[PDB]
Amino acid sequence: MENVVIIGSGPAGYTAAIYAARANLKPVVFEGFRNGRGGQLMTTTEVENFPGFPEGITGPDLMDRMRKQAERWGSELYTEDVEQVDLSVRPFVIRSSDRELRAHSVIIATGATAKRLGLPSENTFWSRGISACAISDGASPLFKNAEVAVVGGGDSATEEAVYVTKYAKHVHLLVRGERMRASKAMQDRVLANPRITVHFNTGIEDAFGGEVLQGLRLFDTRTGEKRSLDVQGMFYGIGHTPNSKLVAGQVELDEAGYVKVAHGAATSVPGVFSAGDLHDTEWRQAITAAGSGCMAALSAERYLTANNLVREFKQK
Amino acid sequence: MENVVIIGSGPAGYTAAIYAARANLKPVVFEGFRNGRGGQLMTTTEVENFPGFPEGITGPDLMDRMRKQAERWGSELYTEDVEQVDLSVRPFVIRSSDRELRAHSVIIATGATAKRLGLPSENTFWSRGISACAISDGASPLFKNAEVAVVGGGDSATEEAVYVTKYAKHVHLLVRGERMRASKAMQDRVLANPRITVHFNTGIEDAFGGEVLQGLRLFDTRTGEKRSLDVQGMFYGIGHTPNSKLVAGQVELDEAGYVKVAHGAATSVPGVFSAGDLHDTEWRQAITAAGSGCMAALSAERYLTANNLVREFKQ
Ligand SMILES: Cc1cc2nc3c(=O)[nH]c(=O)nc-3n(C[C@H](O)[C@H](O)[C@H](O)COP(=O)(O)OP(=O)(O)OC[C@H]3O[C@@H](n4cnc5c(N)ncnc54)[C@H](O)[C@@H]3O)c2cc1C
Ligand SMILES: Cc1cc2nc3c(=O)[nH]c(=O)nc-3n(C[C@H](O)[C@H](O)[C@H](O)COP(=O)(O)OP(=O)(O)OC[C@H]3O[C@@H](n4cnc5c(N)ncnc54)[C@H](O)[C@@H]3O)c2cc1C
């Protein structure tokens, strides 16, 4: 029976595993299989803001590093999707289709996946013209001094559009509806910025290009009339999905579905800790998610010690 | 006049610089000179728990990487000690020995230095037998199934002594006074743990060894009698000093001197943000300090944008 079970193999889950493993807890990590082992960063090619890599590092390369680090210090890694978590009994029950474990503490780090549009060619230009994170990719050479589209109509999209005027020559805010939904302040910010053109009643049919994004096929959401927009970048600003389905109804969540935490990583259920984007509505970065994994691991270790629950394992 | 001024070049200051720079804010970093460019990790040789380095990385090598990354994206780095911070005027004034700058926002990331004993041979065996961080170094090969001393008598030392029984064969808790000062619960853990021997009225005269720590010169703090203790590791558990002297009286601090923060990095003075060990009484890790630097940078960027203060620089 397990000291700790960690659900997730993004930056937060592996950092939690590293700390838990070095604290001799022999953590079990359910990394995800269909949910994507290694997390959201597996779908990006350039990480420039993760401190310690001044030449950049690809997303897969950083997560391959993290995974080995978790294993080196004693982590038990399962490339498996968890299907069920029962927090109404102690020890807790964690079930993947392949196995059922009991654990004194659980760390849930399942992320908050950024909504995508699902355009026919999206996979082609993903990370080569299309991104979901302006803070991360906006500084990229691909968009330097170039024309970029920002998709959405809420506070997220208006915020991203303002942010990418830091690097782009001109920014096209594509709003599917008749009017924007953001606050009056946000819309005012946007309409007072001469580098943003707002297109209303505009939907996206596809992206086109060669090796990198070169434009968009649009349509008017009123007439269906088609129109092409030349752009070399496109940012999605259509929100986020916190992946809390496994603990919905069992731990406190906010209205959008994020896990509520205090003291860094404590959920409303003692023994359950959250790490990463799953509870973070402010930052949504790899470095902060890693920091959150450490907090969650250090919290679990203290929790276990405070209740004399630690099962003893040592280094190999 | 500056968008943001960052005070400190540990993990938290550089991560704040990386984010601020990539947000085209051209941040100014006062890295410290007498306070040590590159932070506390400059004094350790093996960092094994910073995610992304499965083979380990020395402290100097990780910080040299961070510094370069701060510069690549537009950071303005000064190897200088800040001597004064005036938060009673806007924009704020930050004075080093060489220069005085105004700034719309300040990120103070000055750390919390782990107290050392200052033993004659301390520098010799430091990071080759002596550490202040059990979470970081306890798993080190140097202490596997070895006898280790833990110095102190408060809650910090007793928790560390229990923590290092995870790896050491036996732990000698060296207490200078007649009694432990930790809580009754902490003392109970210690006295009910058969792998810990508590030495009272025990002070340390020096450490000895060859290439790695081999023992301790002790004395009784009552009779002065000397006694040698064989150990291959020693952990200091004598607390921490948050480096808030520059903002003392100006931003809210707690009783121990840590900066009070809310919303990740916001201090009591709008526009002033704290990152790193300077405000963290719970974790005190490089990865969390880095995470805190990002929060502070993202907070400053939004603060400046929210007040139409951002001055334009590009890549
Ligand atoms: C295109 C794109 C580019 C980005 N670029 C950057 C960048 O350059 N720098 C940066 O700091 N941030 C970047 N981000 C944001 C960054 O990806 C996130 O902040 C980071 O991944 C959060 O880490 P996390 O571990 O909390 O969540 P995730 O990385 O999403 O990890 C979630 C993990 O939980 C697993 N999981 C989910 N459900 C289950 C289940 N039932 N059972 C088992 N396992 C499960 C998943 O398989 C996955 O491994 C980018 C995001 C996108 C979309
Ligand atoms: C021996 C030892 C080993 C450790 N090993 C690890 C490990 O392996 N992994 C881990 O995660 N953590 C480790 N730690 C803890 C880790 O070092 C800290 O958590 C981390 O350094 C804190 O980061 P920081 O940027 O907030 O503070 P610091 O690294 O302390 O940075 C403080 C910065 O502020 C500068 N500064 C201070 N005052 C001024 C001033 N007036 N003007 C200008 N600049 C100023 C200083 O020069 C310095 O650069 C170790 C600590 C010690 C003591």
Short mmCIF file of N, CA and C in Angstrom, two decimals, chain A residues 15 18-19 22-24 48-56 62 65-66 68-69 72-73 135-136 139 144 163 165-167 189 195 263 282-283 285 287-288 290-291 294-295 298-299 301-302 305-306 312 314-315, chain B residues 15 18-19 22-24 48-56 62 65-66 68-69 72-73 135-136 139 144 163 166-167 189 195 263 282-283 285 287-288 290-291 294-295 298-299 301-302 305-306 308 312 314-315:
data_model
loop_
_atom_site.label_atom_id
_atom_site.label_comp_id
_atom_site.label_asym_id
_atom_site.label_seq_id
_atom_site.Cartn_x
_atom_site.Cartn_y
_atom_site.Cartn_z
N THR A 15 7.89 16.88 -11.02
CA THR A 15 8.57 17.57 -9.93
C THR A 15 8.09 17.05 -8.59
N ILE A 18 9.86 13.72 -8.24
CA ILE A 18 11.27 13.90 -7.88
C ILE A 18 11.42 14.15 -6.38
N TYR A 19 10.67 15.12 -5.85
CA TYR A 19 10.78 15.41 -4.42
C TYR A 19 10.30 14.22 -3.59
N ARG A 22 12.97 11.42 -3.73
CA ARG A 22 14.16 11.67 -2.93
C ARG A 22 13.85 11.66 -1.45
N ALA A 23 12.59 11.90 -1.06
CA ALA A 23 12.21 11.71 0.33
C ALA A 23 11.88 10.24 0.66
N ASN A 24 12.36 9.30 -0.17
CA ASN A 24 12.27 7.86 0.09
C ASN A 24 10.84 7.37 0.20
N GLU A 48 11.51 28.62 -24.00
CA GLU A 48 12.55 29.63 -23.83
C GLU A 48 12.56 30.27 -22.45
N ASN A 49 11.50 30.10 -21.66
CA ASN A 49 11.29 30.78 -20.39
C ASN A 49 11.33 29.81 -19.22
N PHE A 50 11.89 28.62 -19.44
CA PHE A 50 12.07 27.71 -18.32
C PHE A 50 13.48 27.90 -17.80
N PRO A 51 13.66 28.41 -16.58
CA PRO A 51 15.00 28.90 -16.18
C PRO A 51 15.99 27.74 -16.09
N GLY A 52 17.17 27.95 -16.68
CA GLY A 52 18.18 26.92 -16.76
C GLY A 52 18.51 26.46 -18.16
N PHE A 53 17.79 26.92 -19.18
CA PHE A 53 18.02 26.50 -20.57
C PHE A 53 18.16 27.72 -21.48
N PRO A 54 19.29 28.42 -21.39
CA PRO A 54 19.46 29.66 -22.17
C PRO A 54 19.47 29.47 -23.67
N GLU A 55 19.66 28.25 -24.18
CA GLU A 55 19.56 28.03 -25.61
C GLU A 55 18.19 27.55 -26.04
N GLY A 56 17.23 27.50 -25.13
CA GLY A 56 15.96 26.87 -25.40
C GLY A 56 16.06 25.35 -25.28
N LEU A 62 12.63 18.44 -22.65
CA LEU A 62 12.56 18.78 -21.23
C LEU A 62 11.78 17.72 -20.43
N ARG A 65 13.73 14.57 -19.93
CA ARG A 65 14.67 14.81 -18.83
C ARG A 65 14.00 14.65 -17.47
N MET A 66 12.85 15.30 -17.30
CA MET A 66 12.12 15.23 -16.04
C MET A 66 11.74 13.78 -15.70
N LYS A 68 13.17 10.89 -16.56
CA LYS A 68 14.33 10.18 -16.04
C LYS A 68 14.68 10.64 -14.64
N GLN A 69 14.48 11.93 -14.33
CA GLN A 69 14.85 12.42 -13.01
C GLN A 69 13.94 11.82 -11.93
N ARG A 72 15.11 8.13 -11.55
CA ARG A 72 16.42 7.94 -10.94
C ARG A 72 16.32 7.85 -9.43
N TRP A 73 15.46 8.66 -8.83
CA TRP A 73 15.40 8.77 -7.38
C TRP A 73 14.37 7.84 -6.74
N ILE A 135 2.15 34.48 -23.67
CA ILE A 135 3.28 34.72 -22.78
C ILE A 135 4.47 33.87 -23.19
N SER A 136 4.22 32.65 -23.66
CA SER A 136 5.29 31.72 -23.98
C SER A 136 5.82 31.92 -25.39
N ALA A 139 7.06 35.96 -27.98
CA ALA A 139 8.40 36.46 -28.27
C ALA A 139 9.10 35.66 -29.36
N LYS A 144 7.91 37.88 -35.16
CA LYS A 144 8.55 39.16 -34.95
C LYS A 144 8.17 40.11 -36.07
N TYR A 163 -1.41 41.84 -25.58
CA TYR A 163 -0.08 41.32 -25.28
C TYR A 163 0.76 41.12 -26.54
N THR A 165 0.71 42.70 -29.35
CA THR A 165 1.21 43.94 -29.96
C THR A 165 2.61 44.30 -29.45
N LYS A 166 3.09 43.64 -28.38
CA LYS A 166 4.47 43.81 -27.93
C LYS A 166 5.48 43.39 -28.99
N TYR A 167 5.12 42.41 -29.85
CA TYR A 167 6.04 41.83 -30.83
C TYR A 167 5.55 41.91 -32.27
N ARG A 189 -9.45 49.19 -24.07
CA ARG A 189 -8.04 48.95 -24.35
C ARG A 189 -7.83 48.53 -25.80
N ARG A 195 -2.84 49.19 -33.35
CA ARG A 195 -2.25 47.99 -33.92
C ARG A 195 -3.20 46.79 -33.92
N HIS A 263 -2.59 27.00 1.40
CA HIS A 263 -1.28 26.55 1.86
C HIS A 263 -0.47 25.97 0.71
N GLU A 282 -3.97 31.96 -12.57
CA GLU A 282 -3.20 33.20 -12.73
C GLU A 282 -2.01 33.06 -13.68
N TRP A 283 -1.17 32.04 -13.52
CA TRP A 283 0.13 31.99 -14.19
C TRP A 283 0.20 31.01 -15.35
N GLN A 285 2.17 28.45 -16.14
CA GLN A 285 3.50 28.26 -16.72
C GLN A 285 4.12 26.96 -16.24
N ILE A 287 7.28 26.58 -15.26
CA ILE A 287 8.10 26.80 -14.07
C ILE A 287 7.23 26.88 -12.83
N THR A 288 6.08 27.56 -12.91
CA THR A 288 5.24 27.63 -11.71
C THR A 288 4.61 26.27 -11.40
N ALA A 290 5.93 23.30 -12.00
CA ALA A 290 7.00 22.58 -11.31
C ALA A 290 7.13 23.03 -9.86
N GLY A 291 7.12 24.35 -9.63
CA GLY A 291 7.17 24.82 -8.26
C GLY A 291 6.01 24.29 -7.44
N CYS A 294 6.65 20.60 -6.39
CA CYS A 294 7.48 20.55 -5.19
C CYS A 294 6.65 20.82 -3.94
N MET A 295 5.86 21.90 -3.94
CA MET A 295 5.05 22.19 -2.76
C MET A 295 4.18 20.98 -2.40
N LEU A 298 6.33 18.19 -0.89
CA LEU A 298 6.77 18.53 0.47
C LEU A 298 5.60 18.52 1.46
N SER A 299 4.41 18.91 1.00
CA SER A 299 3.21 18.85 1.84
C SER A 299 2.83 17.40 2.18
N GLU A 301 4.78 14.70 2.17
CA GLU A 301 5.76 14.15 3.08
C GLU A 301 5.47 14.58 4.51
N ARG A 302 5.22 15.87 4.72
CA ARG A 302 4.90 16.35 6.06
C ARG A 302 3.60 15.74 6.57
N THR A 305 4.32 12.15 7.65
CA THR A 305 5.08 12.10 8.90
C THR A 305 4.21 12.52 10.07
N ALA A 306 3.38 13.55 9.89
CA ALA A 306 2.55 14.04 10.98
C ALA A 306 1.56 13.00 11.49
N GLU A 312 8.56 2.64 4.85
CA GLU A 312 9.98 2.92 4.68
C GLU A 312 10.49 2.30 3.40
N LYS A 314 14.20 2.96 0.80
CA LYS A 314 15.48 3.64 0.72
C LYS A 314 15.91 3.69 -0.74
N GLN A 315 17.08 4.29 -0.98
CA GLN A 315 17.62 4.44 -2.32
C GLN A 315 18.31 3.15 -2.76
N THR B 15 14.67 34.27 -12.81
CA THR B 15 13.42 33.87 -13.44
C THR B 15 12.52 35.07 -13.63
N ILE B 18 14.02 36.79 -16.63
CA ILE B 18 13.72 36.09 -17.88
C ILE B 18 12.32 36.47 -18.37
N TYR B 19 11.31 36.34 -17.51
CA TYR B 19 9.94 36.66 -17.91
C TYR B 19 9.78 38.14 -18.24
N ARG B 22 11.43 38.87 -21.64
CA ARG B 22 10.67 38.36 -22.78
C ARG B 22 9.38 39.13 -22.98
N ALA B 23 8.85 39.74 -21.92
CA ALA B 23 7.75 40.68 -22.06
C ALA B 23 8.23 42.08 -22.45
N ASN B 24 9.45 42.20 -22.99
CA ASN B 24 9.95 43.44 -23.58
C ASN B 24 10.02 44.60 -22.59
N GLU B 48 20.24 18.15 -7.20
CA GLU B 48 19.62 16.95 -7.77
C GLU B 48 18.11 17.04 -7.91
N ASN B 49 17.47 18.04 -7.30
CA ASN B 49 16.01 18.15 -7.23
C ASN B 49 15.48 19.33 -8.03
N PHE B 50 16.28 19.89 -8.94
CA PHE B 50 15.77 20.95 -9.80
C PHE B 50 15.31 20.31 -11.11
N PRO B 51 14.02 20.36 -11.42
CA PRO B 51 13.51 19.48 -12.50
C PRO B 51 14.12 19.88 -13.84
N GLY B 52 14.58 18.87 -14.58
CA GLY B 52 15.22 19.09 -15.86
C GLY B 52 16.67 18.68 -15.93
N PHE B 53 17.30 18.28 -14.82
CA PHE B 53 18.71 17.90 -14.80
C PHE B 53 18.87 16.52 -14.17
N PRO B 54 18.49 15.47 -14.90
CA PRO B 54 18.51 14.11 -14.33
C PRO B 54 19.89 13.60 -13.97
N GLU B 55 20.96 14.22 -14.45
CA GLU B 55 22.31 13.83 -14.04
C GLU B 55 22.87 14.70 -12.91
N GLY B 56 22.07 15.59 -12.35
CA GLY B 56 22.56 16.60 -11.44
C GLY B 56 23.18 17.78 -12.18
N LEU B 62 24.22 25.83 -12.85
CA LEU B 62 22.81 26.18 -13.03
C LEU B 62 22.60 27.69 -13.02
N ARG B 65 23.81 29.36 -16.17
CA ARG B 65 22.79 29.17 -17.21
C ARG B 65 21.67 30.20 -17.09
N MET B 66 21.14 30.36 -15.88
CA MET B 66 20.06 31.32 -15.67
C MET B 66 20.49 32.74 -16.03
N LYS B 68 22.76 33.81 -18.17
CA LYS B 68 22.78 33.94 -19.62
C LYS B 68 21.37 34.04 -20.18
N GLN B 69 20.43 33.29 -19.61
CA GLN B 69 19.06 33.29 -20.14
C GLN B 69 18.39 34.63 -19.88
N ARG B 72 19.95 36.92 -22.53
CA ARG B 72 19.58 36.66 -23.92
C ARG B 72 18.34 37.44 -24.32
N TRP B 73 17.37 37.55 -23.41
CA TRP B 73 16.07 38.13 -23.74
C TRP B 73 15.95 39.62 -23.43
N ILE B 135 16.34 18.58 3.10
CA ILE B 135 15.53 18.19 1.96
C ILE B 135 16.39 18.03 0.71
N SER B 136 17.39 18.89 0.54
CA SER B 136 18.20 18.91 -0.67
C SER B 136 19.36 17.92 -0.62
N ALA B 139 19.66 13.13 0.81
CA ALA B 139 19.73 11.97 -0.08
C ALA B 139 21.11 11.80 -0.72
N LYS B 144 24.74 8.23 3.01
CA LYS B 144 23.95 7.01 2.96
C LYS B 144 24.46 6.05 4.03
N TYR B 163 14.20 14.03 9.76
CA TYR B 163 14.27 13.89 8.31
C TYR B 163 15.50 13.09 7.88
N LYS B 166 15.92 9.23 7.45
CA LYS B 166 15.53 8.55 6.21
C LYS B 166 16.73 7.92 5.50
N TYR B 167 17.93 8.51 5.66
CA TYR B 167 19.12 8.09 4.91
C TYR B 167 20.30 7.66 5.78
N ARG B 189 8.86 12.98 19.07
CA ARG B 189 9.40 12.33 17.88
C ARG B 189 10.86 11.97 18.07
N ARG B 195 17.04 5.96 16.32
CA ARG B 195 18.17 6.32 15.48
C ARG B 195 18.74 7.70 15.82
N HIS B 263 -1.68 37.04 -3.30
CA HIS B 263 -1.85 36.88 -4.74
C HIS B 263 -0.53 36.45 -5.40
N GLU B 282 7.83 28.10 4.04
CA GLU B 282 7.41 26.71 3.90
C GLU B 282 8.38 25.85 3.09
N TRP B 283 8.80 26.29 1.91
CA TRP B 283 9.47 25.40 0.98
C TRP B 283 10.97 25.67 0.86
N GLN B 285 13.03 26.20 -1.64
CA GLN B 285 13.69 25.43 -2.69
C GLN B 285 13.96 26.31 -3.91
N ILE B 287 13.45 25.41 -7.05
CA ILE B 287 12.37 25.33 -8.02
C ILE B 287 11.22 26.24 -7.61
N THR B 288 10.88 26.28 -6.32
CA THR B 288 9.77 27.15 -5.91
C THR B 288 10.16 28.63 -5.99
N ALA B 290 12.20 29.91 -8.20
CA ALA B 290 12.02 30.17 -9.62
C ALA B 290 10.55 30.38 -9.96
N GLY B 291 9.68 29.49 -9.48
CA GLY B 291 8.26 29.67 -9.73
C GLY B 291 7.76 31.00 -9.21
N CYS B 294 8.74 33.98 -11.61
CA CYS B 294 7.77 34.11 -12.69
C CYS B 294 6.51 34.82 -12.22
N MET B 295 5.93 34.38 -11.11
CA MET B 295 4.73 35.06 -10.62
C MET B 295 4.98 36.56 -10.46
N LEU B 298 5.21 38.23 -13.94
CA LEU B 298 3.90 38.32 -14.58
C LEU B 298 3.01 39.32 -13.87
N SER B 299 3.15 39.43 -12.55
CA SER B 299 2.39 40.40 -11.77
C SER B 299 2.80 41.83 -12.13
N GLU B 301 4.25 42.92 -14.92
CA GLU B 301 3.83 43.25 -16.28
C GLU B 301 2.37 43.68 -16.30
N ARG B 302 1.50 42.90 -15.66
CA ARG B 302 0.08 43.26 -15.61
C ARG B 302 -0.13 44.56 -14.85
N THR B 305 0.80 47.37 -17.21
CA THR B 305 -0.20 47.48 -18.26
C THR B 305 -1.50 48.03 -17.70
N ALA B 306 -1.88 47.61 -16.49
CA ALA B 306 -3.13 48.08 -15.90
C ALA B 306 -3.12 49.58 -15.63
N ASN B 308 -1.21 51.84 -17.62
CA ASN B 308 -0.64 52.48 -18.80
C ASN B 308 0.72 53.09 -18.49
N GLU B 312 8.23 51.36 -23.87
CA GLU B 312 8.42 50.41 -24.96
C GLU B 312 9.89 50.12 -25.23
N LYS B 314 11.98 46.62 -27.39
CA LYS B 314 11.76 45.43 -28.21
C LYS B 314 12.94 44.47 -28.07
N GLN B 315 12.87 43.37 -28.81
CA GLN B 315 13.94 42.38 -28.83
C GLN B 315 15.02 42.83 -29.83
#
